[PDB]
Amino acid sequence: VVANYENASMAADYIKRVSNVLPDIGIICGSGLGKLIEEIEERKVIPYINIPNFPKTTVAGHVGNLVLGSVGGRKIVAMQGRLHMYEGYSNQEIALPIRVMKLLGVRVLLITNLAGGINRKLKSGDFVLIKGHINFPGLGLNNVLVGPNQDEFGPRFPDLSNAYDRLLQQLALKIAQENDFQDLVHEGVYAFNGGPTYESPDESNMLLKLGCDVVGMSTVPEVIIACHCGIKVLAVSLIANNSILDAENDVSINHEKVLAVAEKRADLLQMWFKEIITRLP
Amino acid sequence: VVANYENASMAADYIKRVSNVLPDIGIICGSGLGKLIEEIEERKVIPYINIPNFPKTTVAGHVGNLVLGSVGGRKIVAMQGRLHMYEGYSNQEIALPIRVMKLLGVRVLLITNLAGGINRKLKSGDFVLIKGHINFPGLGLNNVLVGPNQDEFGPRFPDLSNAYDRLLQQLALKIAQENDFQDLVHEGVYAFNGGPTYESPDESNMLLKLGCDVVGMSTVPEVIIACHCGIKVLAVSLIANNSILDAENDVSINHEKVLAVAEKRADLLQMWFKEIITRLP
Amino acid sequence: VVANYENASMAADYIKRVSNVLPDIGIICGSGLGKLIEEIEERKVIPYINIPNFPKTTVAGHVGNLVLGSVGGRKIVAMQGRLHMYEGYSNQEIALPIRVMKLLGVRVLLITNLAGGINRKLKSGDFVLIKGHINFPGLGLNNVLVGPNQDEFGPRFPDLSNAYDRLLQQLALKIAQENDFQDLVHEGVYAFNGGPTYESPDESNMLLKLGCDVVGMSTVPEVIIACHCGIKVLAVSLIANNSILDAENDVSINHEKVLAVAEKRADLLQMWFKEIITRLP
Ligand SMILES: Oc1ncc(F)cn1
Ligand SMILES: Oc1ncc(F)cn1
Ligand SMILES: Oc1ncc(F)cn1
Numbered sequence: 001v002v003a004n005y006e007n008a009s010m011a012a013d014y015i016k017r018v019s020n021v022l023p024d025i026g027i028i029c030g031s032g033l034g035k036l037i038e039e040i041e042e043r044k045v046i047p048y049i050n051i052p053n054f055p056k057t058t059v060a061g062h063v064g065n066l067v068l069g070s071v072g073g074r075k076i077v078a079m080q081g082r083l084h085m086y087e088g089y090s091n092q093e094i095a096l097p098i099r100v101m102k103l104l105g106v107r108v109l110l111i112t113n114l115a116g117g118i119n120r121k122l123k124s125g126d127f128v129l130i131k132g133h134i135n136f137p138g139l140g141l142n143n144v145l146v147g148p149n150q151d152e153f154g155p156r157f158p159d160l161s162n163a164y165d166r167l168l169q170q171l172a173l174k175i176a177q178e179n180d181f182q183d184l185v186h187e188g189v190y191a192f193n194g195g196p197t198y199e200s201p202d203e204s205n206m207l208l209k210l211g212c213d214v215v216g217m218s219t220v221p222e223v224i225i226a227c228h229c230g231i232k233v234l235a236v237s238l239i240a241n242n243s244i245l246d247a248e249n250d251v252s253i254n255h256e257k258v259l260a261v262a263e264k265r266a267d268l269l270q271m272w273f274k275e276i277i278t279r280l281p
Numbered sequence: 282v283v284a285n286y287e288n289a290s291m292a293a294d295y296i297k298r299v300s301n302v303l304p305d306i307g308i309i310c311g312s313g314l315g316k317l318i319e320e321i322e323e324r325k326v327i328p329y330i331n332i333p334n335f336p337k338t339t340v341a342g343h344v345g346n347l348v349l350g351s352v353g354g355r356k357i358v359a360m361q362g363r364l365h366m367y368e369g370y371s372n373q374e375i376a377l378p379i380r381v382m383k384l385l386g387v388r389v390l391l392i393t394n395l396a397g398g399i400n401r402k403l404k405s406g407d408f409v410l411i412k413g414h415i416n417f418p419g420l421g422l423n424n425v426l427v428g429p430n431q432d433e434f435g436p437r438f439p440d441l442s443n444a445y446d447r448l449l450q451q452l453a454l455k456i457a458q459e460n461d462f463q464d465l466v467h468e469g470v471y472a473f474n475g476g477p478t479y480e481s482p483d484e485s486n487m488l489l490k491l492g493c494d495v496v497g498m499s500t501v502p503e504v505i506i507a508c509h510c511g512i513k514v515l516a517v518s519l520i521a522n523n524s525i526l527d528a529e530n531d532v533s534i535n536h537e538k539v540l541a542v543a544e545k546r547a548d549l550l551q552m553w554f555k556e557i558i559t560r561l562p
Numbered sequence: 563v564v565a566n567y568e569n570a571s572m573a574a575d576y577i578k579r580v581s582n583v584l585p586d587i588g589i590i591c592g593s594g595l596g597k598l599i600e601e602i603e604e605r606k607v608i609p610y611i612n613i614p615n616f617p618k619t620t621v622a623g624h625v626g627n628l629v630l631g632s633v634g635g636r637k638i639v640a641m642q643g644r645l646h647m648y649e650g651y652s653n654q655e656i657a658l659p660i661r662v663m664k665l666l667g668v669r670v671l672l673i674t675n676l677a678g679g680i681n682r683k684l685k686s687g688d689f690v691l692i693k694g695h696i697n698f699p700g701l702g703l704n705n706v707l708v709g710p711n712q713d714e715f716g717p718r719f720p721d722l723s724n725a726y727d728r729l730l731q732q733l734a735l736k737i738a739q740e741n742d743f744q745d746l747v748h749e750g751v752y753a754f755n756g757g758p759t760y761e762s763p764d765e766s767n768m769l770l771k772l773g774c775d776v777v778g779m780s781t782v783p784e785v786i787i788a789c790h791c792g793i794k795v796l797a798v799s800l801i802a803n804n805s806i807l808d809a810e811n812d813v814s815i816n817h818e819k820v821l822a823v824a825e826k827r828a829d830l831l832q833m834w835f836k837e838i839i840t841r842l843p
Binding site: 109132133134135136137138140141142143145146147148149155156157158159160161162163189195209210261 | 340341355366367368369382383417420421422423472474475477478479481482483484486487488491527531533534535536
């Protein structure tokens with residue numbers, strides 16, 4: 001299934017027929033950070049398996065829903081269950097849900113994820129507003145846009161220099177200042193490690209030398225498909241460890257330590273993003 | 282279709298039957314830079330679609346011709362319409378036209394492309410004689426030679442240390458000195474970004490740290506297949522922007538700015554390469 | 563053929579029925595360095611082609627055997643003929659033999675390979691105990707674990723920080739000290755170049771900047787599959803050139819120079835690894 005104009009139009013025809021919502025705003029929430037999606041009012045929940053041309057996700061399993069409703073009086077659509085390229089999904093499978101968002105009317109996409117810290121001043125539980133990226137898969141001929149260009153959505157050769165909207169980063173920081181947690185909020189460069197192994201101690205050392213502030217296994221593919229078709233993006237990483245410090249001290253990372261950090265910050269992130277949605281121009 | 286001895290011999294049998302030219306020299310021209318190929322004398326134009334075992338290019342579209350004729354009294358063969366790996370072509374598809382060149386008798390291959398500048402002293406419209414490369418796809422298990430080795434063409438483990446012939450670089454510089462444009466001519470290290478997104482601002486910063494002079498999305502695959510089977514190579518990048526400066530000043534690159542630079546330099550490059558062909562040993 | 567619990571159990575059922583050995587220790591020997599495998603006592607030699615679900619290797623050709631027997635009174639299993647990812651084998655093909663080792667009872671895996679030297683103090687014929695790695699394919703979405711996780715073998719997101727067991731590195735160094743060749747033994751960080759082209763002069767310069775001590779085209783995939791399923795690992799590189807020096811002096815590497823270094827050190831490595839096996843806790 002190619003992520004082309006006709007296959008995405010077929011999916012959007014089904015969603016509109018079921019939901020009766022035309023959303024302006026899309027959200028993709030990171031693992032353990034999706035509590036906001038249960039707070040959506042006047043909801044329709046749509047399993048991916050019921051939507052024409054949506055990718056099959058029965059191998060990886062776990063939740064896979066599109067949720068449409070209202071937050072702060074705004075009309076939104078959420079992916080509940082994010083598709084990760086380390087699972088083996090092709091370029092076409094990742095791109096189609098984003099391109100369906102576009103046809104549904106999404107103009108702004110808000111994204112959260114979990115990441116490892118590389119910059120020395122970053123601590124467990126800090127947040128990082130992403131302002132640029134280093135796309136190791138893209139340099140290495142695994143860019144999410146490798147393949148024929150779908151000209152109806154965007155250009156063959158996109159410019160990523162404003163892929164992370166500066167006015168959205170400012171709005172996010174203003175909201176944290178209003179609530180006296182700006183001291184947790186940083187800006188930084190995100191490195192895309194295809195994964196699924198955690199960054200090794202010597203990979204982490206390397207990324208420091210190359211000026212990365214955080215590293216993770218998601219987000220860059222969705223950002224590129226969104227930028228290709230003219231959707232503005234805000235992306236926020238929650239730091240779950242300092243990998244540079246682990247490397248210098250011979251300490252281990254693991255999934256259980258990571259998920260506990262998400263639990264610790266989930267409710268603050270929920271409230272932050274609720275107010276961001278309410279206050280988007 | 283594997284790029285093996287028999288499939289390439291089948292294609293070469295067809296070309297020789299149609300053209301009545303045995304070329305010594307191959308040329309692959311970059312986008313907007315192929316005007317020289319219309320100046321070829323006593324031509325035969327052969328669409329790729331008519332050549333047995335040549336890769337299908339009807340998805341990407343646009344021109345796809347092999348052109349055989351005479352320049353400066355020398356017998357040449359040109360690819361009019363270059364195959365790019367960001368389109369989704371496999372290793373076998375890229376390699377076969379080069380290996381057919383070899384069976385047709387090509388001993389020297391001359392290549393031009395468009396690239397972004399990373400070295401601070403490089404400006405829009407400068408030329409760069411490539412003297413080595415950093416092959417991010419190759420480090421990342423997308424080398425154009427991944428797969429079984431075709432032993433008839435070359436070794437399992439090639440040495441790339443003289444892939445860019447030093448005497449051809451000297452000849453090119455001598456010709457520019459004769460015409461008083463040597464001040465436009467540099468030498469440099471080319472980084473292969475698989476693409477198709479332009480290098481991001483923070484990717485550009487990274488490449489500076491790693492000692493790259495230019496970056497682009499082509500040329501390294503063809504160079505490796507040519508070196509594998511013993512064809513000498515000259516490769517010249519036309520600089521269409523300084524990406525380090527764009528990053529420091531928060532400026533955008535785009536395809537329309539890039540194509541205008543090609544237009545500005547096309548005729549000088551045409552004349553340069555005409556005299557290079559005439560004067561190859 | 564997926565490298566899942568049932569397909570690997572089917573292979574292990576066949577091996578046990580033929581060999582009557584339950585090994586504790588696995589070995590994977592590098593090119594020209596497998597002489598120890600002929601010294602295995604009370605052997606069974608099993609061609610890969612006869613084992614259910616083992617990957618087909620008739621395209622690459624050359625030896626492909628599993629050998630089970632006794633060394634120093636210990637029960638072992640060896641791969642005679644290593645699978646390399648530059649040949650075009652998928653993730654599943656590489657992983658299955660290691661996962662069969664696990665089901666057969668392997669608790670420790672010992673690995674040797676040939677590599678290029680990047681650290682300036684390393685010379686032709688030196689050995690390097692690997693203590694960490696930089697996995698360019700993994701950063702670039704070609705990690706050997708990309709695809710669905712096989713939960714029976716290990717976790718979705720493994721930690722690689724103790725993938726190279728520290729007590730095994732110490733035991734190896736102690737043995738070299740006992741035999742007065744500790745002056746040949748170093749420790750270092752290994753860069754995985756997917757290959758099959760040798761590291762270029764400017765790739766080598768880059769790797770120095772990023773803190774790599776050696777570079778090669780194997781070993782990291784097997785280490786990751788082993789670590790995933792809880793097998794301890796010792797990995798030793800034999801240095802066959804200094805690629806930083808070749809780059810500064812404009813000198814060439816080649817396969818014939820490399821194989822002669824293996825010949826020069828094969829017998830010392832054979833005896834070293836024999837005593838390591840004998841003395842594993
Ligand atoms: O803490 C952490 N989370 C996700 C990562 F990919 C790496 N490190
Ligand atoms: O100016 C420019 N041309 C091609 C590139 F790949 C990047 N930058
Ligand atoms: O000497 C050497 N051996 C293997 C390599 F991959 C590179 N260099």
